[PDB]
Design an enzyme around this catalytic site. Structure first.
Site, PDB file in Angstrom:
ATOM      1  N   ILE A  25      84.972  76.063  50.329  1.00 49.52           N
ATOM      2  CA  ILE A  25      83.835  76.494  49.467  1.00 49.52           C
ATOM      3  C   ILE A  25      84.237  76.298  48.006  1.00 49.52           C
ATOM      4  O   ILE A  25      83.583  76.873  47.140  1.00 49.52           O
ATOM      5  CB  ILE A  25      83.418  77.946  49.753  1.00 49.52           C
ATOM      6  CG1 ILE A  25      81.907  78.116  49.608  1.00 49.52           C
ATOM      7  CG2 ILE A  25      84.175  78.917  48.871  1.00 49.52           C
ATOM      8  CD1 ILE A  25      81.106  77.082  50.355  1.00 49.52           C
ATOM      9  N   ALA A  29      84.823  75.501  39.147  1.00 49.59           N
ATOM     10  CA  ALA A  29      85.465  76.672  38.496  1.00 49.59           C
ATOM     11  C   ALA A  29      86.988  76.651  38.707  1.00 49.59           C
ATOM     12  O   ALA A  29      87.453  76.017  39.668  1.00 49.59           O
ATOM     13  CB  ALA A  29      84.855  77.954  39.005  1.00 49.59           C
ATOM     14  N   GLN A  30      87.743  77.333  37.843  1.00 50.07           N
ATOM     15  CA  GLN A  30      89.229  77.364  37.933  1.00 50.07           C
ATOM     16  C   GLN A  30      89.687  77.734  39.345  1.00 50.07           C
ATOM     17  O   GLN A  30      89.256  78.778  39.832  1.00 50.07           O
ATOM     18  CB  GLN A  30      89.772  78.420  36.973  1.00 50.07           C
ATOM     19  CG  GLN A  30      90.858  79.301  37.573  1.00 50.07           C
ATOM     20  CD  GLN A  30      90.810  80.692  36.989  1.00 50.07           C
ATOM     21  OE1 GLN A  30      89.798  81.374  37.062  1.00 50.07           O
ATOM     22  NE2 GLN A  30      91.910  81.130  36.402  1.00 50.07           N
ATOM     23  N   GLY A  31      90.545  76.905  39.950  1.00 53.42           N
ATOM     24  CA  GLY A  31      91.126  77.150  41.284  1.00 53.42           C
ATOM     25  C   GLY A  31      90.281  76.582  42.409  1.00 53.42           C
ATOM     26  O   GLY A  31      89.103  76.321  42.182  1.00 53.42           O
ATOM     27  N   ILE A  32      90.878  76.359  43.579  1.00 52.95           N
ATOM     28  CA  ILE A  32      90.082  75.861  44.737  1.00 52.95           C
ATOM     29  C   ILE A  32      90.224  76.891  45.860  1.00 52.95           C
ATOM     30  O   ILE A  32      91.358  77.114  46.315  1.00 52.95           O
ATOM     31  CB  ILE A  32      90.533  74.449  45.157  1.00 52.95           C
ATOM     32  CG1 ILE A  32      90.030  73.387  44.179  1.00 52.95           C
ATOM     33  CG2 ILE A  32      90.091  74.148  46.579  1.00 52.95           C
ATOM     34  CD1 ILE A  32      88.531  73.239  44.146  1.00 52.95           C
ATOM     35  N   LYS A  48      91.652  82.451  48.148  1.00 54.07           N
ATOM     36  CA  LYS A  48      92.126  81.482  47.172  1.00 54.07           C
ATOM     37  C   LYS A  48      93.627  81.289  47.309  1.00 54.07           C
ATOM     38  O   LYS A  48      94.373  82.255  47.491  1.00 54.07           O
ATOM     39  CB  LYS A  48      91.821  81.910  45.732  1.00 54.07           C
ATOM     40  CG  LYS A  48      92.201  80.824  44.724  1.00 54.07           C
ATOM     41  CD  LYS A  48      92.735  81.366  43.414  1.00 54.07           C
ATOM     42  CE  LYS A  48      91.707  82.208  42.693  1.00 54.07           C
ATOM     43  NZ  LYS A  48      92.205  82.622  41.354  1.00 54.07           N
ATOM     44  N   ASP A 144      84.813  84.604  27.638  1.00 52.65           N
ATOM     45  CA  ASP A 144      84.598  83.370  28.439  1.00 52.65           C
ATOM     46  C   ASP A 144      83.479  83.575  29.469  1.00 52.65           C
ATOM     47  O   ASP A 144      83.520  82.908  30.504  1.00 52.65           O
ATOM     48  CB  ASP A 144      85.888  82.848  29.067  1.00 52.65           C
ATOM     49  CG  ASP A 144      85.853  81.360  29.345  1.00 52.65           C
ATOM     50  OD1 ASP A 144      84.873  80.715  28.939  1.00 52.65           O
ATOM     51  OD2 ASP A 144      86.794  80.867  29.982  1.00 52.65           O
TER      52      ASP A 144
HETATM   53  C1  LIG Z   1      76.475  74.987  38.402  1.00 53.05           C
HETATM   54  C2  LIG Z   1      75.837  73.978  39.294  1.00 53.05           C
HETATM   55  C3  LIG Z   1      76.870  73.684  40.309  1.00 53.05           C
HETATM   56  O1  LIG Z   1      77.278  72.554  40.419  1.00 53.05           O
HETATM   57  N1  LIG Z   1      77.269  74.716  41.043  1.00 53.05           N
HETATM   58  C4  LIG Z   1      77.412  74.618  42.371  1.00 53.05           C
HETATM   59  C5  LIG Z   1      76.851  73.572  43.037  1.00 53.05           C
HETATM   60  C6  LIG Z   1      76.993  73.451  44.398  1.00 53.05           C
HETATM   61  C7  LIG Z   1      77.692  74.384  45.113  1.00 53.05           C
HETATM   62  C8  LIG Z   1      78.251  75.437  44.452  1.00 53.05           C
HETATM   63  C9  LIG Z   1      79.000  76.453  45.233  1.00 53.05           C
HETATM   64  O2  LIG Z   1      79.847  76.110  46.009  1.00 53.05           O
HETATM   65  N2  LIG Z   1      78.689  77.707  45.064  1.00 53.05           N
HETATM   66  C10 LIG Z   1      79.317  78.720  45.636  1.00 53.05           C
HETATM   67  C11 LIG Z   1      79.375  78.906  46.985  1.00 53.05           C
HETATM   68  C12 LIG Z   1      80.026  80.002  47.502  1.00 53.05           C
HETATM   69  C13 LIG Z   1      80.632  80.910  46.688  1.00 53.05           C
HETATM   70  N3  LIG Z   1      81.230  81.940  47.290  1.00 53.05           N
HETATM   71  C14 LIG Z   1      82.229  82.637  46.777  1.00 53.05           C
HETATM   72  N4  LIG Z   1      82.374  83.923  47.046  1.00 53.05           N
HETATM   73  C15 LIG Z   1      83.380  84.610  46.545  1.00 53.05           C
HETATM   74  C16 LIG Z   1      84.311  84.005  45.740  1.00 53.05           C
HETATM   75  C17 LIG Z   1      84.147  82.668  45.498  1.00 53.05           C
HETATM   76  C18 LIG Z   1      85.035  81.876  44.640  1.00 53.05           C
HETATM   77  C19 LIG Z   1      86.158  82.403  44.082  1.00 53.05           C
HETATM   78  C20 LIG Z   1      86.908  81.579  43.284  1.00 53.05           C
HETATM   79  C21 LIG Z   1      86.505  80.282  43.058  1.00 53.05           C
HETATM   80  N5  LIG Z   1      85.403  79.809  43.604  1.00 53.05           N
HETATM   81  C22 LIG Z   1      84.672  80.582  44.376  1.00 53.05           C
HETATM   82  N6  LIG Z   1      83.127  82.023  46.044  1.00 53.05           N
HETATM   83  C23 LIG Z   1      80.544  80.699  45.341  1.00 53.05           C
HETATM   84  C24 LIG Z   1      81.117  81.569  44.297  1.00 53.05           C
HETATM   85  C25 LIG Z   1      79.896  79.624  44.826  1.00 53.05           C
HETATM   86  C26 LIG Z   1      78.108  75.557  43.085  1.00 53.05           C
HETATM   87  C27 LIG Z   1      75.474  72.776  38.512  1.00 53.05           C
HETATM   88  O3  LIG Z   1      74.690  71.975  38.950  1.00 53.05           O
HETATM   89  C28 LIG Z   1      76.097  72.548  37.178  1.00 53.05           C
HETATM   90  C29 LIG Z   1      77.525  73.018  37.275  1.00 53.05           C
HETATM   91  C30 LIG Z   1      77.590  74.498  37.527  1.00 53.05           C
HETATM   92  C31 LIG Z   1      77.593  75.274  36.233  1.00 53.05           C
HETATM   93  C32 LIG Z   1      78.874  74.696  38.244  1.00 53.05           C
HETATM   94  O4  LIG Z   1      78.938  75.367  39.247  1.00 53.05           O
HETATM   95  O5  LIG Z   1      80.070  74.075  37.742  1.00 53.05           O
HETATM   96  C33 LIG Z   1      81.227  74.073  38.553  1.00 53.05           C
END
Ligand SMILES: *[C@H]1[C@H](C(=O)Nc2cccc(C(=O)Nc3ccc(Nc4nccc(-c5cccnc5)n4)c(C)c3)c2)C(=O)CC[C@]1(C)C(=O)OC
EC number: 2.7.11.24
Length: 353
Positions: A25, A29-32, A48, A144
Protein backbone atom coordinates in the site's frame (compact mmCIF):
# COMPACT_ATOMS: atom_id res chain seq x y z
CA UNK A 1 11.78 -18.45 14.80
CA UNK A 2 8.67 -16.40 15.59
CA UNK A 3 9.17 -14.34 12.43
CA UNK A 4 8.50 -15.11 8.78
CA UNK A 5 9.73 -13.23 5.74
CA UNK A 6 7.80 -12.10 2.66
CA UNK A 7 9.42 -11.13 -0.62
CA UNK A 8 6.48 -9.18 -2.06
CA UNK A 9 6.32 -5.39 -1.76
CA UNK A 10 9.66 -5.16 -3.67
CA UNK A 11 11.68 -5.88 -0.52
CA UNK A 12 12.11 -8.75 1.92
CA UNK A 13 9.66 -8.13 4.77
CA UNK A 14 10.16 -10.13 7.97
CA UNK A 15 7.21 -9.90 10.36
CA UNK A 16 5.72 -11.77 13.27
CA UNK A 17 3.48 -14.64 12.20
CA UNK A 18 0.49 -12.62 13.45
CA UNK A 19 0.67 -10.43 10.33
CA UNK A 20 -0.05 -12.34 7.12
CA UNK A 21 -1.32 -11.56 3.61
CA UNK A 22 1.05 -8.63 3.26
CA UNK A 23 -0.22 -6.39 0.46
CA UNK A 24 1.72 -3.33 -0.78
CA UNK A 25 0.00 0.00 0.00
CA UNK A 26 3.14 2.18 -0.44
CA UNK A 27 3.19 5.60 -2.21
CA UNK A 28 4.92 9.02 -2.73
CA UNK A 29 4.90 9.90 1.02
CA UNK A 30 8.14 9.34 3.07
CA UNK A 31 8.80 5.56 3.49
CA UNK A 32 7.23 2.49 1.83
CA UNK A 33 4.63 0.56 3.92
CA UNK A 34 2.28 -2.37 3.21
CA UNK A 35 -1.06 -3.63 4.53
CA UNK A 36 -1.56 -6.82 6.52
CA UNK A 37 -4.01 -8.64 8.77
CA UNK A 38 -3.18 -8.96 12.47
CA UNK A 39 -4.86 -12.20 13.50
CA UNK A 40 -4.50 -11.79 17.27
CA UNK A 41 -6.33 -8.45 17.37
CA UNK A 42 -8.68 -9.19 14.43
CA UNK A 43 -7.80 -5.96 12.66
CA UNK A 44 -6.13 -5.06 9.38
CA UNK A 45 -2.94 -3.15 10.15
CA UNK A 46 -0.44 -1.18 8.01
CA UNK A 47 3.26 -2.07 8.68
CA UNK A 48 6.23 0.11 7.75
CA UNK A 49 9.78 -1.19 7.34
CA UNK A 50 12.28 1.53 8.34
CA UNK A 51 15.37 0.89 6.19
CA UNK A 52 18.73 1.68 7.87
CA UNK A 53 17.42 4.09 10.56
CA UNK A 54 21.03 4.89 11.69
CA UNK A 55 22.35 4.92 8.07
CA UNK A 56 23.12 8.64 8.54
CA UNK A 57 22.60 11.29 11.21
CA UNK A 58 19.47 12.86 9.71
CA UNK A 59 17.81 9.47 9.19
CA UNK A 60 18.15 8.59 12.88
CA UNK A 61 16.84 11.95 14.10
CA UNK A 62 13.58 11.59 12.20
CA UNK A 63 13.19 7.89 13.01
CA UNK A 64 14.05 8.43 16.68
CA UNK A 65 11.64 11.33 17.31
CA UNK A 66 8.57 9.84 15.63
CA UNK A 67 9.22 6.60 17.51
CA UNK A 68 9.14 8.21 20.96
CA UNK A 69 6.34 10.62 20.06
CA UNK A 70 3.92 8.15 18.49
CA UNK A 71 4.61 5.82 21.45
CA UNK A 72 3.31 8.35 24.01
CA UNK A 73 0.63 10.24 22.03
CA UNK A 74 -2.95 9.19 22.74
CA UNK A 75 -5.33 10.98 20.40
CA UNK A 76 -8.01 9.90 17.95
CA UNK A 77 -6.79 12.34 15.28
CA UNK A 78 -3.11 11.33 15.53
CA UNK A 79 -1.88 7.94 14.37
CA UNK A 80 -0.76 5.63 17.15
CA UNK A 81 1.75 2.83 17.64
CA UNK A 82 0.26 -0.62 18.22
CA UNK A 83 3.42 -2.77 18.22
CA UNK A 84 7.10 -2.17 17.43
CA UNK A 85 9.40 -5.05 16.55
CA UNK A 86 12.71 -5.91 14.92
CA UNK A 87 13.66 -9.37 13.62
CA UNK A 88 17.30 -9.08 14.68
CA UNK A 89 18.17 -10.25 18.20
CA UNK A 90 21.50 -8.41 18.39
CA UNK A 91 22.33 -4.74 18.78
CA UNK A 92 25.58 -5.46 16.91
CA UNK A 93 23.73 -6.83 13.86
CA UNK A 94 20.62 -4.70 14.45
CA UNK A 95 19.53 -3.31 11.10
CA UNK A 96 15.79 -2.71 10.56
CA UNK A 97 12.65 -1.69 12.46
CA UNK A 98 8.97 -2.29 11.66
CA UNK A 99 6.09 -0.04 12.75
CA UNK A 100 2.48 -1.20 12.97
CA UNK A 101 -0.49 1.16 13.34
CA UNK A 102 -4.27 1.31 12.67
CA UNK A 103 -4.84 0.83 8.91
CA UNK A 104 -6.82 3.58 7.08
CA UNK A 105 -8.55 3.55 3.66
CA UNK A 106 -6.97 6.59 2.02
CA UNK A 107 -4.98 9.82 2.45
CA UNK A 108 -6.47 13.33 2.38
CA UNK A 109 -5.20 13.84 -1.21
CA UNK A 110 -7.55 11.03 -2.42
CA UNK A 111 -10.49 12.39 -0.45
CA UNK A 112 -9.82 15.82 -1.97
CA UNK A 113 -10.50 14.31 -5.43
CA UNK A 114 -14.08 13.53 -4.41
CA UNK A 115 -15.78 16.88 -3.87
CA UNK A 116 -17.55 16.79 -0.52
CA UNK A 117 -20.20 18.68 1.47
CA UNK A 118 -20.19 21.25 4.26
CA UNK A 119 -21.01 18.77 7.02
CA UNK A 120 -18.26 16.35 6.00
CA UNK A 121 -15.74 19.09 5.18
CA UNK A 122 -16.24 20.81 8.54
CA UNK A 123 -15.68 17.50 10.35
CA UNK A 124 -12.45 16.84 8.44
CA UNK A 125 -11.10 20.31 9.23
CA UNK A 126 -12.31 20.10 12.83
CA UNK A 127 -10.29 16.93 13.38
CA UNK A 128 -7.13 18.54 11.96
CA UNK A 129 -7.49 21.52 14.31
CA UNK A 130 -7.80 19.31 17.40
CA UNK A 131 -4.74 17.34 16.32
CA UNK A 132 -2.66 20.52 16.04
CA UNK A 133 -3.86 21.75 19.46
CA UNK A 134 -2.85 18.40 21.01
CA UNK A 135 0.58 18.70 19.35
CA UNK A 136 0.91 22.40 20.35
CA UNK A 137 -0.21 21.24 23.82
CA UNK A 138 3.08 19.35 24.13
CA UNK A 139 4.92 22.22 22.38
CA UNK A 140 5.20 20.57 18.95
CA UNK A 141 4.82 22.63 15.72
CA UNK A 142 4.78 20.60 12.50
CA UNK A 143 5.38 23.19 9.72
CA UNK A 144 5.00 20.35 7.15
CA UNK A 145 1.23 19.68 7.21
CA UNK A 146 0.11 18.54 3.74
CA UNK A 147 -2.71 16.52 2.12
CA UNK A 148 -0.28 13.58 1.91
CA UNK A 149 0.62 13.62 5.60
CA UNK A 150 -3.05 13.20 6.55
CA UNK A 151 -4.94 9.89 6.43
CA UNK A 152 -8.68 9.24 6.81
CA UNK A 153 -10.97 6.23 7.13
CA UNK A 154 -14.33 5.74 5.43
CA UNK A 155 -16.25 7.17 8.41
CA UNK A 156 -14.31 10.44 7.85
CA UNK A 157 -12.15 9.85 10.94
CA UNK A 158 -8.97 11.84 10.36
CA UNK A 159 -5.44 11.05 11.54
CA UNK A 160 -2.03 12.69 11.07
CA UNK A 161 0.96 10.57 9.95
CA UNK A 162 3.94 12.90 10.48
CA UNK A 163 5.02 14.82 13.60
CA UNK A 164 6.70 17.66 11.69
CA UNK A 165 10.15 18.98 10.76
CA UNK A 166 10.90 19.44 14.47
CA UNK A 167 13.30 22.29 15.24
CA UNK A 168 15.03 24.32 12.50
CA UNK A 169 15.33 25.31 5.57
CA UNK A 170 13.67 24.68 2.20
CA UNK A 171 16.49 22.34 1.05
CA UNK A 172 16.29 19.40 3.49
CA UNK A 173 18.01 15.98 3.40
CA UNK A 174 16.88 12.65 1.96
CA UNK A 175 14.50 11.48 4.75
CA UNK A 176 12.51 14.69 4.48
CA UNK A 177 10.61 15.95 1.38
CA UNK A 178 10.29 19.76 0.95
CA UNK A 179 6.59 19.87 -0.21
CA UNK A 180 6.52 23.74 -0.39
CA UNK A 181 2.93 24.12 -1.70
CA UNK A 182 1.19 24.44 1.70
CA UNK A 183 3.92 26.35 3.52
CA UNK A 184 3.38 29.74 5.20
CA UNK A 185 4.99 33.11 4.38
CA UNK A 186 7.27 32.87 7.43
CA UNK A 187 8.58 29.45 6.38
CA UNK A 188 9.67 30.92 3.03
CA UNK A 189 10.84 34.29 4.42
CA UNK A 190 12.96 32.86 7.24
CA UNK A 191 11.51 35.44 9.63
CA UNK A 192 10.71 32.92 12.38
CA UNK A 193 7.66 30.91 13.33
CA UNK A 194 5.20 30.59 16.17
CA UNK A 195 2.22 28.27 16.69
CA UNK A 196 0.01 30.07 14.14
CA UNK A 197 2.06 28.75 11.20
CA UNK A 198 0.03 25.52 11.04
CA UNK A 199 -3.17 27.56 10.65
CA UNK A 200 -1.85 28.63 7.25
CA UNK A 201 -1.41 25.03 6.10
CA UNK A 202 -5.00 23.96 6.82
CA UNK A 203 -6.14 27.10 4.99
CA UNK A 204 -4.43 25.96 1.80
CA UNK A 205 -5.85 22.45 2.25
CA UNK A 206 -9.37 23.74 2.86
CA UNK A 207 -9.10 25.99 -0.18
CA UNK A 208 -7.72 23.05 -2.16
CA UNK A 209 -10.80 21.00 -1.24
CA UNK A 210 -13.09 23.75 -2.50
CA UNK A 211 -11.06 24.88 -5.51
CA UNK A 212 -10.07 21.34 -6.49
CA UNK A 213 -6.39 22.16 -6.99
CA UNK A 214 -3.39 23.54 -5.16
CA UNK A 215 -4.06 27.14 -4.13
CA UNK A 216 -0.43 28.32 -4.51
CA UNK A 217 1.53 26.28 -7.09
CA UNK A 218 5.17 27.41 -7.20
CA UNK A 219 7.76 26.20 -9.69
CA UNK A 220 10.73 27.07 -7.45
CA UNK A 221 11.41 28.47 -3.99
CA UNK A 222 9.90 31.95 -4.53
CA UNK A 223 7.54 31.27 -7.42
CA UNK A 224 5.24 30.15 -4.62
CA UNK A 225 6.01 33.46 -2.92
CA UNK A 226 4.99 35.33 -6.06
CA UNK A 227 1.88 33.13 -6.27
CA UNK A 228 0.81 33.98 -2.71
CA UNK A 229 0.83 37.77 -3.06
CA UNK A 230 -0.52 37.47 -6.62
CA UNK A 231 -3.92 36.35 -5.30
CA UNK A 232 -4.05 37.25 -1.60
CA UNK A 233 -2.36 40.61 -2.07
CA UNK A 234 0.85 42.53 -1.52
CA UNK A 235 1.86 42.61 2.16
CA UNK A 236 1.07 45.99 3.69
CA UNK A 237 3.90 48.21 4.98
CA UNK A 238 3.91 47.25 8.68
CA UNK A 239 4.75 43.64 7.82
CA UNK A 240 7.63 44.52 5.49
CA UNK A 241 9.59 46.48 8.12
CA UNK A 242 10.35 43.55 10.40
CA UNK A 243 11.98 41.18 7.89
CA UNK A 244 15.76 40.94 7.70
CA UNK A 245 17.26 43.43 5.22
CA UNK A 246 18.63 41.11 2.53
CA UNK A 247 15.17 39.88 1.48
CA UNK A 248 13.15 42.82 2.86
CA UNK A 249 14.00 44.90 -0.23
CA UNK A 250 13.37 41.88 -2.47
CA UNK A 251 9.83 41.67 -1.12
CA UNK A 252 9.47 45.39 -1.88
CA UNK A 253 11.31 45.19 -5.22
CA UNK A 254 9.03 42.66 -6.92
CA UNK A 255 5.91 43.77 -8.84
CA UNK A 256 3.12 44.89 -6.53
CA UNK A 257 -0.32 43.26 -6.62
CA UNK A 258 -3.53 44.68 -5.19
CA UNK A 259 -4.73 41.08 -4.86
CA UNK A 260 -8.06 39.35 -5.36
CA UNK A 261 -10.80 39.28 -2.77
CA UNK A 262 -11.91 35.95 -1.33
CA UNK A 263 -15.37 36.62 -2.78
CA UNK A 264 -14.25 35.85 -6.35
CA UNK A 265 -11.21 33.79 -5.36
CA UNK A 266 -13.69 31.36 -3.73
CA UNK A 267 -17.01 32.01 -5.47
CA UNK A 268 -20.30 30.55 -4.30
CA UNK A 269 -20.84 28.84 -7.67
CA UNK A 270 -18.66 25.81 -6.94
CA UNK A 271 -19.96 25.73 -3.34
CA UNK A 272 -23.24 23.82 -2.89
CA UNK A 273 -25.68 25.91 -4.83
CA UNK A 274 -29.49 25.87 -4.64
CA UNK A 275 -29.24 25.73 -0.85
CA UNK A 276 -29.27 28.83 1.25
CA UNK A 277 -27.84 26.90 4.20
CA UNK A 278 -24.91 25.67 2.13
CA UNK A 279 -24.67 29.17 0.66
CA UNK A 280 -24.72 30.57 4.20
CA UNK A 281 -22.08 28.11 5.34
CA UNK A 282 -20.19 29.14 2.22
CA UNK A 283 -20.24 32.55 3.87
CA UNK A 284 -19.07 30.72 6.99
CA UNK A 285 -16.25 29.13 4.98
CA UNK A 286 -15.00 32.35 3.37
CA UNK A 287 -15.01 34.31 6.63
CA UNK A 288 -12.76 31.73 8.31
CA UNK A 289 -10.71 31.45 5.12
CA UNK A 290 -10.18 35.18 5.52
CA UNK A 291 -9.05 34.68 9.12
CA UNK A 292 -6.49 31.97 8.34
CA UNK A 293 -5.22 33.03 4.90
CA UNK A 294 -3.53 36.21 6.13
CA UNK A 295 0.20 36.45 5.46
CA UNK A 296 0.73 38.49 8.63
CA UNK A 297 1.40 35.87 11.30
CA UNK A 298 0.68 37.87 14.44
CA UNK A 299 -2.97 38.68 13.65
CA UNK A 300 -3.69 35.25 12.16
CA UNK A 301 -6.52 33.24 13.65
CA UNK A 302 -5.38 30.73 16.26
CA UNK A 303 -6.54 27.10 16.36
CA UNK A 304 -8.36 27.73 19.63
CA UNK A 305 -10.29 30.59 18.04
CA UNK A 306 -10.61 28.58 14.82
CA UNK A 307 -12.05 25.67 16.81
CA UNK A 308 -14.73 28.00 18.22
CA UNK A 309 -15.61 29.40 14.79
CA UNK A 310 -19.27 28.88 13.80
CA UNK A 311 -18.11 26.74 10.85
CA UNK A 312 -16.16 24.43 13.18
CA UNK A 313 -17.82 24.92 16.60
CA UNK A 314 -20.78 22.72 15.60
CA UNK A 315 -18.58 19.63 16.10
CA UNK A 316 -16.97 20.90 19.29
CA UNK A 317 -16.58 18.05 21.79
CA UNK A 318 -13.91 18.50 24.50
CA UNK A 319 -12.82 14.88 24.15
CA UNK A 320 -10.73 15.68 21.05
CA UNK A 321 -9.97 19.33 21.90
CA UNK A 322 -9.50 19.74 25.68
CA UNK A 323 -7.65 16.46 26.10
CA UNK A 324 -4.90 15.80 28.66
CA UNK A 325 -1.64 17.06 27.16
CA UNK A 326 1.06 14.56 26.16
CA UNK A 327 4.31 14.43 28.13
CA UNK A 328 7.49 13.28 26.35
CA UNK A 329 10.19 11.41 28.37
CA UNK A 330 14.04 12.40 25.19
CA UNK A 331 14.20 15.43 27.46
CA UNK A 332 17.14 16.02 25.14
CA UNK A 333 14.83 16.02 22.14
CA UNK A 334 16.96 19.05 21.24
CA UNK A 335 20.27 17.24 20.70
CA UNK A 336 22.37 15.02 18.40
CA UNK A 337 24.81 12.23 19.28
CA UNK A 338 26.94 9.46 17.76
CA UNK A 339 25.63 7.25 14.96
CA UNK A 340 26.43 4.24 17.14
CA UNK A 341 24.83 6.02 20.10
CA UNK A 342 21.86 6.79 17.84
CA UNK A 343 21.58 3.10 16.92
CA UNK A 344 21.73 1.85 20.52
CA UNK A 345 19.07 4.24 21.83
CA UNK A 346 16.51 3.37 19.15
CA UNK A 347 17.29 -0.29 19.82
CA UNK A 348 16.42 0.31 23.48
CA UNK A 349 13.32 2.20 22.34
CA UNK A 350 11.98 -0.68 20.24
CA UNK A 351 12.77 -3.40 22.82
CA UNK A 352 10.84 -2.06 25.85
CA UNK A 353 7.09 -2.45 25.34
C1 LIG B 1 -2.34 12.59 -3.87
C2 LIG B 1 -2.83 11.84 -5.06
C3 LIG B 1 -2.15 10.53 -4.98
O1 LIG B 1 -1.42 10.19 -5.88
N1 LIG B 1 -2.40 9.82 -3.89
C4 LIG B 1 -2.67 8.51 -3.96
C5 LIG B 1 -3.00 7.94 -5.15
C6 LIG B 1 -3.28 6.60 -5.24
C7 LIG B 1 -3.23 5.80 -4.13
C8 LIG B 1 -2.90 6.36 -2.93
C9 LIG B 1 -2.86 5.49 -1.73
O2 LIG B 1 -2.24 4.46 -1.75
N2 LIG B 1 -3.52 5.87 -0.68
C10 LIG B 1 -3.52 5.24 0.48
C11 LIG B 1 -3.97 3.96 0.65
C12 LIG B 1 -3.96 3.38 1.89
C13 LIG B 1 -3.49 4.05 2.98
N3 LIG B 1 -3.53 3.40 4.14
C14 LIG B 1 -2.73 3.65 5.17
N4 LIG B 1 -3.15 3.48 6.41
C15 LIG B 1 -2.35 3.71 7.44
C16 LIG B 1 -1.06 4.13 7.24
C17 LIG B 1 -0.65 4.27 5.94
C18 LIG B 1 0.69 4.73 5.55
C19 LIG B 1 1.66 4.97 6.47
C20 LIG B 1 2.87 5.41 6.00
C21 LIG B 1 3.06 5.62 4.65
N5 LIG B 1 2.08 5.39 3.79
C22 LIG B 1 0.92 4.97 4.22
N6 LIG B 1 -1.49 4.01 4.95
C23 LIG B 1 -3.06 5.33 2.78
C24 LIG B 1 -2.53 6.23 3.83
C25 LIG B 1 -3.07 5.91 1.56
C26 LIG B 1 -2.63 7.71 -2.84
C27 LIG B 1 -2.47 12.57 -6.29
O3 LIG B 1 -3.01 12.32 -7.34
C28 LIG B 1 -1.41 13.62 -6.24
C29 LIG B 1 -0.36 13.13 -5.28
C30 LIG B 1 -0.91 13.02 -3.89
C31 LIG B 1 -0.77 14.32 -3.14
C32 LIG B 1 -0.09 11.97 -3.25
O4 LIG B 1 -0.59 11.07 -2.62
O5 LIG B 1 1.35 12.01 -3.37
C33 LIG B 1 2.10 10.89 -2.96
Amino acid sequence: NNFYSVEIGDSTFTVLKRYQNLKPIGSGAQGIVCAAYDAILERNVAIKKLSRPFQNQTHAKRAYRELVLMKCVNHKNIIGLLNVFTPQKSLEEFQDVYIVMELMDANLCQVIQMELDHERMSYLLYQMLCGIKHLHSAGIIHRDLKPSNIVVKSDCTLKILDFGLARTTSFMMTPYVVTRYYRAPEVILGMGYKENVDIWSVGCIMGEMIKGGVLFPGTDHIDQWNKVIEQLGTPCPEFMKKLQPTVRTYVENRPKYAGYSFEKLFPDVLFPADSEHNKLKASQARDLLSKMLVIDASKRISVDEALQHPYINVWYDPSEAEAPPPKIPKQLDEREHTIEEWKELIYKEVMDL
